[PDB]
Structures are given as structure tokens and as C-alpha cells.
Amino acid sequence: NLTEMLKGSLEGCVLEIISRRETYGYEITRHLNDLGFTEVVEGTVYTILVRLEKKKLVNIEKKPPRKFYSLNEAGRQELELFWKKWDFVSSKINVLKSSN
Amino acid sequence: NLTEMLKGSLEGCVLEIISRRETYGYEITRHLNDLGFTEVVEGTVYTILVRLEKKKLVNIEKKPPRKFYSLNEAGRQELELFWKKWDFVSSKINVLKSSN
């Protein structure tokens, strides 16, 4: 049960996945499952994709009815900020772990 | 602004701090600030300490009116689980980062 711990990082993982190429909810979910986040279900990814759309971080396209997501410039900018935040937070938590 | 990302890990960082020796809210807060989580304020630590008390993870002592916190056996058990969760979640997020 990693939900609470993973919650605050999950939007970024999704942005990272969408960055690699045009994709869609089902495939994002399976990619997160394949990574080892087996408890991540489609509805969790759906909700994230909605948040990313309202923040205007992704370009959308109805293709052959499915929405295809890729990153726009804001999205790439935002993904960069996420990883800088991740690197900082994780390094400091590991500095703390390092003493037990 | 690391609050959302740090939120799901902050209770564990506190448990880790209390584990090292008997301590109290102000000192825990300053320890987190000194680590680099400068936006962590006392009220955030207070709220966490309350959660840890209701989960019965800490022994409390009114000493010379301040409450002194140390870990009981449940608390040590729980801290161990937190770090196992942290190691898993962070390793998988870093596996993902490793491809950009």
C-alpha cells in the first residue's frame, strides 16, 4: 500500500511517461504497473490526465474514441521542475536514512 | 514548495528523528529545517505528533509543560516499514528518471 507515499509523485511519473511519446490512459497505467506500481489503476491515471489537461500541460488528440496525450511546452517545463523537486526531496530523505 | 511531494513521507522522517533519542516538536521541526525542509513549521510537526500518538507509535512523557516523545515497539516496527516502502518507491521512480 504505497498510495499515500506515491500520491505526491504520481503526476510527475505520468508526465515523464507521456514525454517519451504520444500515449493514452490504459497504456500509461500498464507502464506504471510494469514499473512495479501494481496498485495503480486506470481511474487513478484518468484523474491525473484530467488535472494535466486543466493545467494546460498536454496536447490532446482524438485519434483512431480515444484521447491521445503528448507534452506541450508547459508540460516539458513542468516535468523538469518535478524532477528537480524529486532530486532535492529524495536526496534529503536519503541523507536522513543514511544514519540508520 | 515541496509540501505535496513531502507530505506522504513526512510522518516517516519524524519517526526516524524521534528514534535517535527522546525529543519534542520544536526540536524535530528545527532538525527538518536543518536538513533542508525549510518550509516545515511547528504546526506541521505538531499535527504529525498527534497522528503518531493516536496510532500508539510513541511513548510520551511530561518533563521539565512539554511532552517528550520517544519510540515504542510499534513505532520502531512502523519506522522499519516506512523505510522499506521508501526504498521501493524511490528506486522505481529513479528507474524511471534514469531514462531522461
Author numbering:
A (entry chain A), B (entry chain A): 3 to 66, 72 to 107
Recite the paper's sentences.
In this study, we have determined the crystal structures of bcPadR1 and bcPadR2, which are the products of gene loci BC4206 and BCE3449 of B. cereus strains ATCC 14579 and ATCC 10987, respectively. The bcPadR1 and bcPadR2 subunits contain a typical wHTH DNA-binding domain, consisting of helices α1, α2, the DNA recognition helix α3 and strands β1 and β2 (together forming the wing), and a dimerization domain, including the C-terminal helix α4. Unlike LmrR, but like the other PadR-s2 proteins with known structure, the bcPadR1 and bcPadR2 dimers have a completely closed dimer interface. The closed dimer conformation and inaccessibility of the conserved tryptophan residues of the bcPadR proteins are incompatible with a drug-binding mechanism as observed in LmrR.
